[PDB]
Design an enzyme around this catalytic site. Sequence first.
Site, mmCIF file in Angstrom:
data_model
loop_
_atom_site.group_PDB
_atom_site.id
_atom_site.type_symbol
_atom_site.label_atom_id
_atom_site.label_comp_id
_atom_site.label_asym_id
_atom_site.label_seq_id
_atom_site.Cartn_x
_atom_site.Cartn_y
_atom_site.Cartn_z
ATOM 1 N N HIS A 1 108.140 83.499 -60.484
ATOM 2 C CA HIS A 1 109.554 83.537 -60.864
ATOM 3 C C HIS A 1 110.050 84.966 -60.906
ATOM 4 O O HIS A 1 109.408 85.827 -61.528
ATOM 5 C CB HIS A 1 109.745 83.023 -62.301
ATOM 6 C CG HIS A 1 109.636 81.545 -62.458
ATOM 7 N ND1 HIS A 1 108.429 80.888 -62.473
ATOM 8 C CD2 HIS A 1 110.583 80.602 -62.683
ATOM 9 C CE1 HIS A 1 108.637 79.599 -62.659
ATOM 10 N NE2 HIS A 1 109.935 79.398 -62.782
ATOM 11 N N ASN B 1 101.028 87.812 -62.864
ATOM 12 C CA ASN B 1 102.007 86.752 -63.182
ATOM 13 C C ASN B 1 101.795 86.079 -64.549
ATOM 14 O O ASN B 1 102.701 86.008 -65.383
ATOM 15 C CB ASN B 1 101.994 85.661 -62.105
ATOM 16 C CG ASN B 1 102.967 84.557 -62.406
ATOM 17 O OD1 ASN B 1 104.094 84.811 -62.872
ATOM 18 N ND2 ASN B 1 102.556 83.326 -62.164
HETATM 19 MG MG LIG Z 1 105.809 84.251 -63.727
#
Ligand SMILES: [Mg+2]
Lengths: 247, 245, 286
Positions: B89, B121
């Site tokens: 994201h 992440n």
């Molecule tokens: Mg992420």
Amino acid sequence: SLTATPSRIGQIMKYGFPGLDHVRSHSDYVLSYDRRNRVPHWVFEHLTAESVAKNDAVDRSKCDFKQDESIHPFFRSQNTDYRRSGYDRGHMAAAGNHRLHQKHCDETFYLSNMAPQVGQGFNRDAWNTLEAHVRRLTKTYSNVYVCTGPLYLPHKEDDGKSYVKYEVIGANTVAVPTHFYKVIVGESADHKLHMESYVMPNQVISNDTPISVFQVPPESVERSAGLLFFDQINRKQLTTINGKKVA
Amino acid sequence: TATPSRIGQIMKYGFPGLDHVRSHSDYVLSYDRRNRVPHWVFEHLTAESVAKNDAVDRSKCDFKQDESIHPFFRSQNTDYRRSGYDRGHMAAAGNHRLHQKHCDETFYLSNMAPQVGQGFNRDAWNTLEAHVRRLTKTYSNVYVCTGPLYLPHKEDDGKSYVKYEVIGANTVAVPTHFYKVIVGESADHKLHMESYVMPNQVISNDTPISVFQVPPESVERSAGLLFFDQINRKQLTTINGKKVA
Amino acid sequence: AQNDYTIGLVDPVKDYQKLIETRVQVDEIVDDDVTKENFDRTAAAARDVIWRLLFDEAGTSQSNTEKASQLLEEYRGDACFYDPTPYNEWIVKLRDEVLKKELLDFWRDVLVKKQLGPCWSRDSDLFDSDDTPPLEFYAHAGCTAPFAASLKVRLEEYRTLMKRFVIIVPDSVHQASVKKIAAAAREIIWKLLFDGTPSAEDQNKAAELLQEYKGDAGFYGPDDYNSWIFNLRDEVLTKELLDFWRDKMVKMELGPSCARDSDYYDNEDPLPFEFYEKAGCKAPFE
Ligand SMILES: [Mg+2]
Ligand SMILES: [Mg+2]
């Protein structure tokens, strides 16, 4: 005429915009500037026999490569970046495509219209041959529309993975594209539309290599560039693509 | 149901660029069709919009292709599966908790870039995301731009090159680094900027995120974008914790 | 058949992999709704077979437990990417059945050791470090999560002058600083050659500078050079500096700048043959 004109931009961009990143208009071409790479994303041109004709009133010798002051200083390429880099300052919109007036030609010498190109064997030879061909197309088609730009294409490595890699030159890290394209639409006397598209690698190419060998389906250029060319034309309404009849 | 457009509110301080801009319910995205990831996303956070909400359940969200993107430039789950990379994201799901739909929209693959999973992440990058959310306790409003970088390295030959992996049949670019440039608005109306660049690689859980603070102008030069261009940098009170004086 | 997701007990993992490969991992653009359902139906068939391999009491455990272990591992690897929730809920019931039936080797050697409990941030991009790790799942029958311990811890006069004086500088300024060193190169050359009759040494020093000044001119803009070089040639020929003309200006190609030397030019541009065509000479090219 002597500046960017609303009527002329709309003439040049008749078939749509490939993209909308940092789009700038000159008197006789349109430029989308890639601030990250310090070269164009693309340029767009609409050529006629008149506009590519040799004009005694256009002296290319009065033209010099110069920084574009309408670009923020962080994202400008400079002559210092190209000096002794092993690369030419290579026009995207060629100076020879713009001969209606001195200033039209002058404006192709902004460094924002430049990308690093191999000199001998490309910029000065094979790539010029393609440029010369697009100008000669005006003898077949009354109006020739052309989009020119850089590509940065992947290759496979020993690990089996794919990578994009390219040199960046100078303190301003000007990107050296792996390849360049031209995607072209000619309008015939009848209402027929004909498309040509080429991808040539940014390397020494043999002088005996015909430009025809560099013909690629336009969709593969689109997929690689992250752009859509001639979006106002349905491809099912073209008459030919790279000399080949459409259904 | 506020009257001014949400895109206008989020983009208060300027547009870093105008390529392929999409407005979701609670974030703004510029999509890089060539790389099949964003150029940038922009978010405007408040304590309310990042607060735990019974009515938002992240586990109900699915990673999905963005059908508003032309097929040629659309990343797909098949591109990420067994790539060695997470679907990362840019606009984090935890930043958008006013409504389920706002959260669901961050799971468009158009909001994703390939990110190292463990050690990045799922960890260090999440630590930075959590830090930006925690800033809503200090500042009434927090504006943040997040995006990828593709940074050069110098080789033995003295030349510099940009190199990055592309994954799947859709050749999705694997960025070398990611940034956040952040502005907090104080109760006294003063403006405070922070600016981080983190490598897309395994980072120790011990590493303080302050290690990754860099001058905002360095990020701008590298990104090819201008962040918060409506703020004169002399108008800021602090940049990365240091007084502007 | 289209709506059949058959996983046989003969080679379960292979049947499972074929369904994923053909119905889920499709490198053609498909509605995500379709792909999600396709995986959900493959997952459900995999869960059924694993349960049967472990508890049916057909065959031998030697064989069937191994089949279940391999299918469970492959299935979990996909679930971490496509759909961890159904796996996370089902694996708890599977454990509970494993423990009730006192299959403790399978609990210890497979579910615990191979970490085949709930998907979490260690193995799935659907999770992160702020989510609760599934430590409790594993705390049964004297076992603990293998990751438990980890969580607790978490010429040269011209050159030097060009090197010194030649940063965001306006073109006209940088143009002038280039001109100043250009004019200064042109004026000493004219001295070296025309203060009197130039020595062999001074003809070498003039040719030395003229080659490097030409090179720099070809990058910075050779228009001044292209005008002036004609003036120099005419003066070389009026003073009868034939040695200089032939061995320096002709031989070393010191005429007008062109596509041979500069990016100001390309193929279609006319080469300067005519410049060299004096005193019987020809251009050193082609
Ligand atoms: Mg992420
Ligand atoms: Mg050229």
